[PDB]
Ligand binder design. Structure first.
Ligand SMILES: CCCc1cc(=O)[nH]c(Nc2ccccc2F)n1
Length: 464
């Protein structure tokens, strides 16, 4: 990894564009006015890419050679990068202040600030905008996942009277559905801030290495089938596939994809009749989990439950909601996103089915169908020191007031009613509010404050 080759190309030319005699460039990140966001991911970036000796004579030579061909001109700031190498042993003269990880902050608030600590490195602040702005992705995954936890919490409490097993209601199925191995690890770790169920194994190593838990692992899984392990038996032998799989995992929970040919036939005739004796004998700690995996997600879930409800002993819980026996459950993991998740639980409640009957799996909806525009994650310069004088800078495009940026030195505070406020123009210096919630997490190539994955999960908890 070479940080000199880890920026937007045009940023290579920006050192020549700042007003002459600029000693400071101060920038901040926000999720411009999903009312509140989970701040998560920055610590990974600081350790992986920004800390320690990030500049060497070889990295300067490599960047110089690439940029000469890429621009068909000499525009690369070799003197600037050589200054960092010689003065600071390749350590970045940068200071990063950030809200603690796991913190749930409303939109339009300062989340982190970036500034150079050496006047010669005025251009460095925004060189690292590209790398830091990528924090939009763990923030958006964590926020979107927590928003789904809110819907699940609401319907589970309404239909069962408690939140038992809530942390296992939304399982990460997204490993294949993401853009890369690195994305898989980041995205799966962001989902684990809110839930305990994951199939994206990559998230586990990321958490262990960069964050850490008291528990051996942050996430869990159970044995399960795929279309290949069912279909390999042959179309006429689907019952043999089902029987072999539940017998192999007779003492632990097991999920079986039952839609290879006919989901409704599998539920009513295979599970409901032919193999019913292998299901009713299962323990409460080892249920059979039936997975439908095609068709309209709501219509399939409702039809599956109605079939099962007629083949198996159904009870009525204390809230008046239908409950399948404890050895039988359902998992819907096809076409699941925040919108379809809301449709399914609402449809289930209307048909008097308890939410304890179902669990969800989400792949692309959880980890990939997200963009930087969803929470309007933005990095902008708010303050500059030129000719020894600090000036408050901002953008204010005529055609879009939403793109108006914050002015001057920023700080984050708790208001008297316990809400949040971002103070602009250095007004935090007048101690009218509390202590600034931003902490220095990075300074001069060193990580100065870190959080465990346990602290992050505690910070990101739902009020309930
Ligand atoms: C309940 C956790 C175990 C489980 C149950 C299940 O039916 N499927 C899976 N995983 C899965 C399915 C489709 C795509 C990608 C995936 F990782 N894991």
């Amino acid at each position: 990894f070479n940080i000199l080759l880890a920026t937007d190309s045009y940023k290579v030319t920006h050192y020549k564009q700042y007003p002459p005699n600029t000693s400071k460039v101060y920038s901040y990140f926000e999720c411009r006015e999903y009312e509140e966001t989970v701040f998560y991911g920055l610590q990974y970036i600081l350790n992986k890419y920004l800390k320690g000796k990030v500049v060497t004579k070889e990295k300067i030579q490599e960047a110089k050679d690439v940029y000469k061909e890429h621009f068909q001109d000499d525009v690369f700031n070799e003197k600037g990068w050589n200054y960092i190498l010689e003065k600071y042993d390749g350590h970045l003269p940068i200071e990063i202040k950030a809200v603690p990880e796991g913190f749930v902050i409303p939109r339009g608030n300062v989340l982190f600030t970036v500034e150079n600590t050496d006047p010669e490195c005025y251009w460095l602040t925004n060189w690292i905008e590209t790398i830091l702005v990528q924090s939009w992705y763990p923030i958006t995954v964590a926020t979107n996942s927590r928003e789904q936890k809110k819907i699940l919490a609401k319907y589970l409490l309404e239909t069962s009277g408690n939140l038992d097993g809530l942390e296992y209601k939304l399982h990460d199925f997204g490993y294949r559905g993401v853009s890369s191995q690195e994305t898989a690890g980041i995205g799966a770790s962001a989902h684990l801030v809110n839930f305990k169920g994951t199939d994206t194994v990559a998230g586990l190593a990321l958490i262990k290495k960069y964050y850490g838990t008291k528990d051996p692992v942050p996430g869990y899984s159970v044995p399960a089938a795929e279309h290949s392990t069912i279909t390999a038996w042959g179309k006429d032998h689907e019952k043999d596939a089902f029987e072999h799989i539940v017998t192999q995992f007779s003492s632990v929970p097991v999920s079986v994809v039952s839609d290879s040919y006919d989901i409704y036939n599998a539920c009513e005739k295979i599970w409901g009749e032919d193999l019913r004796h292998l299901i009713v004998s299962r323990s409460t700690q080892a249920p059979l989990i039936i997975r439908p995996d095609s068709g309209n997600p709501l219509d399939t879930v409702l039809k599956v439950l109605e079939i099962l409800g007629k083949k198996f002993p159904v009870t009525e819980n204390s809230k008046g909601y239908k409950l399948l026996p404890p050895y039988l459950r359902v998992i819907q993991g096809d076409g699941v996103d925040i919108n379809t998740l809301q449709e399914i639980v609402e449809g289930m409640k209307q048909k008097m089915w308890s939410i304890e009957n179902i669990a969800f799996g989400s792949g692309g909806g959880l980890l990939q169908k997200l963009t930087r525009d969803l929470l309007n994650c933005s990095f902008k310069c708010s303050y500059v020191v030129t000719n020894g004088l600090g000036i408050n800078v901002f953008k204010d495009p005529v055609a879009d007031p939403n793109k108006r940026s914050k002015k001057g030195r920023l700080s984050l505070h708790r208001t008297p009613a316990g809400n949040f406020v971002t103070l602009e123009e250095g007004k935090g210096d007048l101690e009218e509010y509390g202590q600034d919630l931003l902490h220095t997490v990075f300074k001069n190539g060193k990580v100065t404050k870190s959080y465990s994955f346990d602290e992050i999960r505690k910070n990101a908890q739902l009020n309930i």
